Amino acid sequence: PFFPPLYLGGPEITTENCEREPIHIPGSIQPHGALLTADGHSGEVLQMSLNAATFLGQEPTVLRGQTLAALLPEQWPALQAALPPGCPDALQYRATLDWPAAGHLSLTVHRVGELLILEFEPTEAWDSTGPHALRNAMFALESAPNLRALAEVATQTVRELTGFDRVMLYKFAPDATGEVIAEARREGLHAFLGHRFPASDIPAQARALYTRHLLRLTADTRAAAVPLDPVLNPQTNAPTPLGGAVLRATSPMHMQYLRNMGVGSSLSVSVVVGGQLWGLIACHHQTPYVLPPDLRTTLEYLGRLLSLQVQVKEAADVAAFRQSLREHHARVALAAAHSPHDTLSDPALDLLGLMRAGGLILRFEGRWQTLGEVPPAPAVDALLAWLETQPGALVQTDALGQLWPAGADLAPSAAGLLAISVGEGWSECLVWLRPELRLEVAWKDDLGPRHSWDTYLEEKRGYAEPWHPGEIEEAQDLRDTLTGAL
Amino acid sequence: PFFPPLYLGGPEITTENCEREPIHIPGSIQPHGALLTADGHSGEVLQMSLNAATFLGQEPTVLRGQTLAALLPEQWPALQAALPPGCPDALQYRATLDWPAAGHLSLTVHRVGELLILEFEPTEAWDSTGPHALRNAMFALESAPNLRALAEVATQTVRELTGFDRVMLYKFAPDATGEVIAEARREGLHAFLGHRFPASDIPAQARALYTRHLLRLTADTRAAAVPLDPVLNPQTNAPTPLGGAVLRATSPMHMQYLRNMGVGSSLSVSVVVGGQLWGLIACHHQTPYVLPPDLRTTLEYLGRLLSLQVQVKEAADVAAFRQSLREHHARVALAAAHSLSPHDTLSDPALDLLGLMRAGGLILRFEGRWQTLGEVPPAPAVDALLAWLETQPGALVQTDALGQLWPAGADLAPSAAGLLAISVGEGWSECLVWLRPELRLEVAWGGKDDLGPRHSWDTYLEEKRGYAEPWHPGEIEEAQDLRDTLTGAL
Ligand SMILES: */C=C/C1=C(C)C(=O)N/C1=C\C1=NC(=C\c2[nH]c(/C=C3/NC(=O)C(C=C)=C3C)c(C)c2CCC(=O)O)/C(CCC(=O)O)=C1C
Ligand SMILES: */C=C/C1=C(C)C(=O)N/C1=C\C1=NC(=C\c2[nH]c(/C=C3/NC(=O)C(C=C)=C3C)c(C)c2CCC(=O)O)/C(CCC(=O)O)=C1C
């Protein structure tokens, strides 16, 4: 459940109840633009930001209670044509206005229910920066060999077009955590490459909102938001949804985070693959930065292109990895034809590198042998005894401490486990073991990157590197072969 | 196998041997530009088109045997940097040049093996009426309800940006055929919406070539190609691969087709999903069109974006369809709980077992007797069909044309061309058979034996004779789920 917003008797957002914060209805916008809401049918301006009078150059009393057809006679029909009733709030229609007071303005309108939300930012007359920018970024992404090079080129490209001090790319691991897989920074800044952060750092509502709206920015981390007048929607006397508004006021908690990082401005472009938030492009600047809408649009384009390239490169990496496992598997099967303990213990066969494991346990003919980093012999006997109790032919776990409590002490030597049964039961089996996940800092007790890394390692205590799904499939495929080779 | 090109003793390209045409090595370019090839390491200009001398403004003898550093000292280092050796040939590097002879030119270079292929076209700025038109179009495509709305918005958008008289989108059916699912045309032109063409109209080489390079242009369908001098690659004395070349001469067969349509210029944007050519965006104009480089960037972007979005919207259409079949399945299962007479229960028009599988006929075999619902072939043919089902193994049988799988049933094609049978009990004593009529369609325009669109539609209908509408995967899955449901009803 969500807490009520602060302007409706809502509880104060703290570090303990930050998950239930209604970040989609702050009732306020960022001061670098102006926001208006009008009826979807009539066009009567209802809500207004307190700074819209200064931005538009028109008195606040005159603007309210005035139809959009009188204010914007050239775009109102095309606005209703672009945003039909029932359209998703993600659908945005942008047009350029020319006013004598504020110059050229960028209008961004989206429809939420029965309410049209218009956003106003200062724009350029003609933007020739973008036509070739899209060409160069697209060509740069198309010339990447693999995922790592793709991410490096992506971050460097974003930094080149924008000028941000730091541009990073997070990948979301299956456990909802994040990891900086590539980074392009200015000379003289600590590196976040390889740093990982817990899932609690990005709340659920923030992730779903990032999936529905790919771009979201925080212009000034120390600027106060500009409320809406009125704060509630006169049509329903209910909070106004600002998830689709790019001018949405950033949550005070996240602004406190960025201030604890020395970041003045932040911008995030989502990377969605298959309808899932695969990763995120982050931008950090030490000074308050407001990206112009025309160039920011180029960043959005880059968001879509990177989603496609990540899809392709991941499919190719899993294809080549699966094939490499099949060639290694053929290398083992040929040795299984002319064969058990002495055969599989051959270092030339390398059963450790097959599953990328640190330890190996081979149970055959009433005896067990080990290879690599493996817990002491009595601990091995206890582990095999527990393996016989487990049903099925395949056992897999990222952290053996959770599935086997008495095996929590042997976690640093064997945290991840992947066991298969050659014969029915567990009389003859093959067990792969992986050590505890150990990492080092990429470079205050309060919330921040330091705290985040510390709590990330504390939350993954006892865990190991997760088993790749192709290694699991290949494990069962190997079990079926060795069953018939004896 | 491929036939040798015309400049190596190759046979004349006719309508009978058009499949084996080496369209990737025509040895010539289109006359609206100039093409050069140079060594990937040194930069020595090797091959040249005979019109490049007039186009570039320098004598042909002087250009050959001259390094690219001497011709273009400003772009050569960035050119070699942008196209490193080993890069894919699909990778294109585009830049604008200013020459005193021909004026401003658009350069498009790609690397094939040890050969750098440079392309020169006359250029111009491009002013789209909507500065925000591309962005608004992007959100319009992403906020599309289904695949057909997505295609409609896509075609209309392409026509708006380009100005072509006709803009269409083909979807490639599993049987490698094509179908125009959306169209944006100028007022006063016959519609191709719903028109289908056979797989033979686009050869395999053309399909793969469309997969590797998203954009393909035919400026003038009545212009003669300009050969290369020399025609072979001096490095290997082998034909020069022009699949990456945008100036590659279009096959004479396809130009003859477009002329039979009255189309002067053609432009194609490929739609690649999962490494497979899912569909294609075609543009037809009565006048030759040369796209500005900025517009090329916009179309390529729409190619990739549509490649991404079509996958999403199609997956969503299959999700909603499967959900509709799940509700339809539950409504029948509730009637299977309270059973009185199985034959009378499934024959209920309120349950609508015909609309469940989108079938025209239904055969219900239980307790040694069989009943029918809807358009069903005569009774003795039904007895023969059920006996053939007893010969057939498995619990589920599916076919688009039963005449191929069962020869003696070819005569029953008009009443039941497609077949989907499930066995309630083990064996075929009790079974359920869905039947679909022969695929019948109508012309896209509604009013010549030579090569053209009409010919394509006619040969498409002759190749789909005896065939029916293919079974949607959700209908098959729901069929097996229904077998598992009805097994426990006994
Ligand atoms: C439970 C409350 C929150 C804690 C604690 C916290 O750290 N953030 C909390 C709420 C929100 N985070 C939002 C966006 C966001 N958060 C991160 C987290 C990081 N974790 C790290 O370890 C590091 C660096 C070492 C970071 C930066 C990121 C990357 C982002 C998105 C990027 C960006 O927009 O700048 C968030 C969303 C608000 C909004 O934009 O509307 C909330 C709320
Ligand atoms: C076996 C030779 C060919 C016959 C016969 C033929 O009709 N085309 C043949 C070869 C090529 N076709 C190429 C592209 C292409 N072909 C079609 C087919 C159509 N089917 C139709 O119903 C219609 C019109 C109503 C057409 C035009 C299409 C749609 C296309 C794609 C481009 C376009 O729409 O014009 C082709 C490749 C040419 C190249 O690479 O430049 C060859 C070769």
From Swiss-Prot, chain A:
Top-level taxon of the source organism: Bacteria
Residue ranges of every copy of the PAS domain listed in the record: 20-88
Modification(s) after translation: Contains one covalently linked tetrapyrrole chromophore. Lacks the cysteine conserved in plant phytochromes (at the position of Met-253) that binds chromophore. An engineered sequence used for X-ray crystallography forms a thioether link to biliverdin through Cys-18. The natural sequence can bind phycocyanobilin and phytochromobilin in vitro, but the identity of the natural chromophore is unknown.
Chain's gene name: bphP
Region (Chromophore binding domain): 89-486
Disulphide-bonded residues: none
Span of domain GAF: 146-310
Gene Ontology biological process: detection of visible light; osmosensory signaling via phosphorelay pathway; regulation of DNA-templated transcription
Name of the protein in question: Bacteriophytochrome
EC number: 2.7.13.3
Top enzyme category: transferase
Protein's job: Photoreceptor which exists in two forms that are reversibly interconvertible by light: the R form that absorbs maximally in the red region of the spectrum and the FR form that absorbs maximally in the far-red region. Also has a slight blue shift for the far-red maximum. Could also absorb green light. May participate in regulating pigment synthesis like the carotenoid deinoxanthin which could protect the bacterium from intense visible light.
Transcription in keyword set: no
Protein family (similarity comment): In the N-terminal section; belongs to the phytochrome family.
Lineage, highest ranks first: Bacteria, Thermotogati, Deinococcota, Deinococci, Deinococcales
MF annotations from Gene Ontology: ATP binding; identical protein binding; phosphorelay response regulator activity; phosphorelay sensor kinase activity; photoreceptor activity; protein kinase activator activity
